[PDB]
Swiss-Prot record, chain A:
Forms part of two intersubunit bridges in the 70S ribosome. Binds to 23S rRNA. SMART domains: Ribosomal_L14 (SM01374). InterPro entries: Ribosomal_uL14, Ribosomal_uL14_arc, Ribosomal_uL14_CS, Ribosomal_uL14_sf. Belongs to the universal ribosomal protein uL14 family. This is Large ribosomal subunit protein uL14. One of its GO terms (molecular function) is large ribosomal subunit rRNA binding. One of its GO terms (biological process) is translation.
From Swiss-Prot, chain B:
GO terms for biological process: translation. One of its GO terms (cellular component) is cytosolic large ribosomal subunit. Gene3D superfamilies: 3.30.1430.10, Ribosomal protein L3, domain 3 (4.10.960.10), Translation factors (2.40.30.10). It comes from Haloarcula marismortui (strain ATCC 43049 / DSM 3752 / JCM 8966 / VKM B-1809) (Halobacterium marismortui). One of the primary rRNA binding proteins, it binds directly near the 3'-end of the 23S rRNA, where it nucleates assembly of the 50S subunit. This is Large ribosomal subunit protein uL3. GO terms for molecular function: rRNA binding; structural constituent of ribosome.
UniProtKB/Swiss-Prot annotation, chain C:
Its cofactor is Zn(2+). Residues 44-53 have a biased composition (Basic and acidic residues). It comes from Haloarcula marismortui (strain ATCC 43049 / DSM 3752 / JCM 8966 / VKM B-1809) (Halobacterium marismortui). The gene is rpl24e. One of its GO terms (molecular function) is structural constituent of ribosome. Part of the 50S ribosomal subunit. Forms a cluster with proteins L3 and L14. This is Large ribosomal subunit protein eL24. It comes from the Archaea. GO terms for cellular component: ribonucleoprotein complex; ribosome. The keyword Iron does not apply.
Length: 132, 337, 53
RNA sequence: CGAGUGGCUUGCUACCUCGAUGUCGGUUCCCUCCAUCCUGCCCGUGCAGAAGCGGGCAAGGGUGAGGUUGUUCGCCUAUUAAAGGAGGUCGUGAGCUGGGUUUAGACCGUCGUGAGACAGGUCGGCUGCUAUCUACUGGGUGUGUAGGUGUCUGACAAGAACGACCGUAUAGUACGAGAGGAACUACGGUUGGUGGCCACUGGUGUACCGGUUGUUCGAGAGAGCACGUGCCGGGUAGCCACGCCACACGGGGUAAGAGCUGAACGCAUCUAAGCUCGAAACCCACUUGGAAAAGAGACACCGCCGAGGUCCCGCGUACAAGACGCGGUCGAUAGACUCGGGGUGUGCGCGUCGAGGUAACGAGACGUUAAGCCCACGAGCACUAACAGACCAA
RNA sequence: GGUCUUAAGGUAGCGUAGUACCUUGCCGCAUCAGUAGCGGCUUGCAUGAAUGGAUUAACCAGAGCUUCACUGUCCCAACGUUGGGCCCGGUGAACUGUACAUUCCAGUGCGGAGUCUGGAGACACCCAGGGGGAAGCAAAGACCCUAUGGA
RNA sequence: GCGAAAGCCAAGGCCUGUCGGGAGCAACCAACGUUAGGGAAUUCGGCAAGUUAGUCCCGUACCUUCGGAAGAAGGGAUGCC
RNA sequence: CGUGGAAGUCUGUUAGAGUUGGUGUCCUACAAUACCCUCUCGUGAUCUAUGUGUAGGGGUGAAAGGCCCAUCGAGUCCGGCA
């Protein structure tokens, strides 16, 4: 994929429970897989800010609940390094559900987003109220 | 069927034993292309800081923007090319033919060598030129030594001697180029060989750690779960199968880890200067204050503070040189805190 | 830059930036400041802090 | 239908072991095979393209995470370039585990007159030993080569030190009616592996500083104990990973294959002689080791009454003993002192305030006070200690 | 089949059961995915009424399963603490020992060799290590068969 | 303090749960402390560890043999002067 | 509403009794059954000292073929016995 422009320490793993930052009807998401990732023996497949991940809907409306959808990691508690050396971290771990064309499923994004994610996923960015 | 997995550690840096010389020895030199010149230099590791730079890479979207880069500070005072050793091409490889020495010797070189009192430079030189005529002259290298005395933070005064190759143009021209350098007093500097922005190969003898187990030394796993409580925590599963009935040298075992020679490739020289511009407040921890000829190597450099490191023009660079990088800022913040 | 907590100048190529839930951004110059901030302490009340003094 | 190869399954046999070669599955760590799953290079196509299908060379590297089940096997999910198979006493219990098989207790079903049985099910049910030899990982002492110091050489040896993927431009282009949709090359990044390093972020930090509970030293001050810090907060150096740095290109020779020239065979023919090409594979390149390479090596200087070394002394860039490195007054090697640079967070005492209380008394607030206390780092500094002095040696 | 063996011919219930071979039975719940667990069905290889059936509040170091919470169980390991380990003084065993013994790759041999054969490698001695081999040490195999053995 | 509980301390007893010296004291082992992000992905199985916790106030489901379930659950409070 | 204070009743390392898991430590042990943490019972079919009775095809047994002096699907000693 296109460079993020930031070093990321994946703060999530397969099976992790994160926040679904949007109005799709899905409240809590469960990480199932990480797009384009291949681990090593005994390693839990890791995911971090800027990654496209397969996801499971744990909490939310009956219609959204139990569905297997794709999402993009928008925020993570574990720090990331910016080109100027500074570290950046968020209040929570969040992702936004996405379609086949990488366009946000819902109409509105909740909470802030990373500028690096915004650059990689344009249509997701052009839906963000705040970009840090 | 039990998953595949790369082995623990590399079999390319063995045997993993204590190094013979604390002074690194390059086992390879750069090519003979440009003008005649010394193919290496040396200094003493001081410590680290970070620097702010302007992106030199024309292929980066961040070209022109400020970038924070980690840097190791190395005191690189002038050295002395005390002699010129010539090698001859024999059926059993290269062998030392003769050497051409000098008159001027550093006041404290006798702490290591049995300094020459009666030498014949002319005769040796002739022998070398005769071998050149015969078409048997191998390569030309200079016997060099550092001046630890020039570095306050370094305790030793006993100089560190190391042979450095001279490559460049025609053998005839670099022979003369070498001889001239030696004649004066052999005094040369980092400037003479390197330019900020070039890629160098840094060789050094790693930080010593004495004996360590397979986990640390080879990166093997620790016993997991229930296995970690039975009486085994950091011991490998087994020393090998029933057959072959012997332990293979390839299985991760305990032993000397650290204090080995390493040659780190493609190290960018961020800046070569002189003074106290890079010194940290309160002094570099476990080293001291830098105020003299130094070099700023991008990233890490093998070895502890005070250790002798060697420089050599990158033998296999991946990028094209982006000379004299613009240094917007050099951190002087204390390394304590 | 200045530390949004203690108030001293943040050494360039150092520090962390905490992004609050609402999108607010807080530049910390060190772990010490972040930790005192997490204890619910307010810079003004701490004598060693450049803000207070 | 016919001919075989293998020795992974099963069966057969009864050679070997019954004065015992510890089970299945799993795990961990190492090596290998190729009948190749991916990756490289190729041929064919019912090959437009894209995506496939079949075949050839090829074992360098890779082949991962999870849900049920003790399971092996297998079924299933989502990722993936792909999530290949097999051998090593069905590798691996003087390594681990002990869920299953297969002791002694018990239940159910079936069978039995019964004791009790079951190639049925089920709950419970133990894991010994101080390594002599050999083997390997690392560390020393001697002898050989036959005075010492320093620098080298390179027989050999090891490596995967690098493997793979995504994205951008090429390009909405070639191709195609359209749908759809490549490549060469150049770039950016990711993943796995590898080696190193700690400026940065992170962890530790029973160094240190602070808060504070119970109790004891009469109170105060200041302390001990509460498991090897009472607990809570912060945390330096160092050590670290979750942090940071680095890990080609190119040559040479080939395989499959594509060809040139070319005869046997006037023609034809990539082959028979000859030649041009051509794989992630081979060799070189690169990294690591390596004078014990018995052809036991080379160079330079110093020295054979003296070069040099060991002991000794102060110490670590070193370290389980040994070894290694540096300094030793012609000195900054270690300590003290003082600065600097750091940690904590405002000391004792006194003054004012303080809800109240007649007063006694009073938790606490402010000031004095960026205070007090503390530092595994640096600098200055010969004050103290590196003294005295011994021995080996061509 | 629309009685026959042998007296009767399975009623209430419960049921893929700690009983169900087929079997991971089928449907549903739950999960990304559930040979598990629960509910329903149930023709039950071979359930069933003091050989007691069903059912059940309370109780349980009893067997199985699910959720919240928590966490170094794991991703993936690091640093530290105390006692050992290592070096020195003193004290001072045991296991084990046909012999020889520096081995490695192959082969051969009673078909599982440090000692045979062919090669390869190999200067001696010592310190520390984790245990690959000595079909390692410890026990005249509990398994199985045999004995005109025992209980 | 509820207490013959913990923890601390007397009286009384003891330094004889009877070998020492040394090395920031390595690997490895026994006990154990702390670990960022994730949070059972580990494993036959949360085995091991951890989480919770004392007291008062509020409040409390199915079921039930009416005893119980029940400290259900959940929420609030807690010092000193 | 109070009084009352029942219970093979609850919590409880009170004393005391017991022994679930760690398949930890040990396994030429401290020990021929030990150590630590964890865990169960703790007014009763309770625990415990001393005294006393039951004896080997016999006792004793809330039954495990458990126990009867480290000895039990028939104790131990000596004899039959070479
Ligand atoms: Cl393990
Ligand atoms: Cl996955
Ligand atoms: K046998
Ligand atoms: Mg695994
Ligand atoms: Mg620092
Ligand atoms: Mg800082
Ligand atoms: Mg054996
Ligand atoms: Mg083949
Ligand atoms: Mg291979
Ligand atoms: Mg086996
Ligand atoms: Mg074994
Ligand atoms: Mg065993
Ligand atoms: Mg053992
Ligand atoms: Mg079982
Ligand atoms: Mg069982
Ligand atoms: Mg069912
Ligand atoms: Mg009846
Ligand atoms: Mg026998
Ligand atoms: Mg039998
Ligand atoms: Mg009989
Ligand atoms: Mg954690
Ligand atoms: Mg698993
Ligand atoms: Mg437990
Ligand atoms: Mg009695
Ligand atoms: Na053990
Ligand atoms: Na065959
Ligand atoms: Na096994
Ligand atoms: Na291969
Ligand atoms: Na499975
Ligand atoms: Na075997
Ligand atoms: Na075995
Ligand atoms: Na075992
Ligand atoms: Na096993
Ligand atoms: Na080639
Ligand atoms: Na019946
Ligand atoms: Na009971
Ligand atoms: Na831990
Ligand atoms: Na062994
Ligand atoms: Na009453
Ligand atoms: Na116990
Ligand atoms: Na008897
Ligand atoms: Sr060299
Ligand atoms: Sr070399
Ligand atoms: Sr065990
Ligand atoms: Sr063998
Ligand atoms: Sr082949
Ligand atoms: Sr292929
Ligand atoms: Sr099998
Ligand atoms: Sr099956
Ligand atoms: Sr295997
Ligand atoms: Sr078992
Ligand atoms: Sr039984
Ligand atoms: Sr059976
Ligand atoms: Sr079974
Ligand atoms: Sr493209
Ligand atoms: Sr289109
Ligand atoms: Sr204490
Ligand atoms: Sr050919
Ligand atoms: Sr020699
Ligand atoms: Sr019926
Ligand atoms: Sr032989
Ligand atoms: Sr040992
Ligand atoms: Sr007393
Ligand atoms: Sr004594
Ligand atoms: Sr702490
Ligand atoms: Sr689990
Ligand atoms: Sr699981
Ligand atoms: Sr509460
Ligand atoms: Sr009771
Ligand atoms: Sr058990
Ligand atoms: Sr013990
Ligand atoms: Sr035992
Ligand atoms: Sr424990
Ligand atoms: Sr109780
Ligand atoms: Sr007798």
């Amino acid at each position: 994929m296109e460079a993020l422009g930031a070093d990321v320490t994946q703060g999530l793993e397969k099976g992790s429970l994160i926040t679904c930052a949007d109005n799709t009807g899905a409240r809590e998401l469960k990480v199932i897989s990480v797009h384009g990732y291949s681990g090593t023996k005994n390693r839990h497949p890791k995911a971090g800010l800027g990654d496209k991940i397969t996801v499971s809907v744990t909490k939310g409306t009956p219609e959204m609940r139990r569905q297997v959808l794709e999402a993009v990691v928008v925020r993570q508690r574990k720090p990331i390094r910016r080109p100027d050396g500074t570290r950046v971290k968020f209040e929570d771990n969040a992702a936004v559900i996405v379609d086949e064309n990488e366009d946000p499923r819902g109409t509105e994004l909740k909470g802030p987003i990373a500028r690096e994610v915004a650059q990689r996923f344009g249509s997701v960015a052009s839906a963000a109220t705040m970009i840090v | 069927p039990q998953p595949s997995r790369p082995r623990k550690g590399s079999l390319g840096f063995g045997p993993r034993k204590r190094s013979t010389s604390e002074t690194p020895r390059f086992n390879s030199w750069p090519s003979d292309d440009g003008q005649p010149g010394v193919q290496g230099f040396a200094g003493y590791k001081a410590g680290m800081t970070h620097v702010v730079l302007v992106n030199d890479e024309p292929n980066s979207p961040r070209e022109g923007m400020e970038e924070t880069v980690p840097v190791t500070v190395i005191e690189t005072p002038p050295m002395r090319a005390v002699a010129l050793r010539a090698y001859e091409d024999t059926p059993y490889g290269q062998r030392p033919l003769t050497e051409v020495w000098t008159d001027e010797f550093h006041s404290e070189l006798d702490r290591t060598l049995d300094v020459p009192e009666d030498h014949d430079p002319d005769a040796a030189e002739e022998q070398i030129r005769d071998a050149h005529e015969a078409g048997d002259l191998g390569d030309l290298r200079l016997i060099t030594h550092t001046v630890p005395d020039a570095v306050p933070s370094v305790p030793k005064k006993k100089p560190d001697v190391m042979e450095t190759r001279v490559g460049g143009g025609s053998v005839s021209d670099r022979l003369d180029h070498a001889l001239d350098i030696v004649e004066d007093g052999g005094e040369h500097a980092m400037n003479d060989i390197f330019r900020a922005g070039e890629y160098a190969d840094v060789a050094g003898v790693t930080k010593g750690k004495g004996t360590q187990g397979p986990v640390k030394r080879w990166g093997v796993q620790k016993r997991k779960g229930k296995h970690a409580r039975q009486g085994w925590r950091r011991r490998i599963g087994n020393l090998g199968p029933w057959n072959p009935s012997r332990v293979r040298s390839t299985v991760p075992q305990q032993g000397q880890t650290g204090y080995h020679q390493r040659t780190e490739l493609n190290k960018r020289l961020i800046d070569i200067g002189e003074g106290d511009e890079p010194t940290v407040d309160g002094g570099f921890v476990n080293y001291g204050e830098v105020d003299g000829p130094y070099t700023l190597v991008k990233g890490s450099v093998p070895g502890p503070d005070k250790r002798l490191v060697r420089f050599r023009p990158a033998v296999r660079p991946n990028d094209q040189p982006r000379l004299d990088p613009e240094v917007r800022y050099v951190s002087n913040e204390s390394n304590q805190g | 830059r200045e530390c949004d907590y203690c108030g001293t100048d943040i050494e360039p190529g150092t520090g962390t930036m905490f992004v609050h839930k609402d999108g607010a951004t807080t530049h910390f110059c060190s772990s010490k400041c972040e930790n005192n901030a997490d204890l619910g302490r307010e810079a003004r009340n701490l004598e060693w802090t450049d803000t207070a003094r």
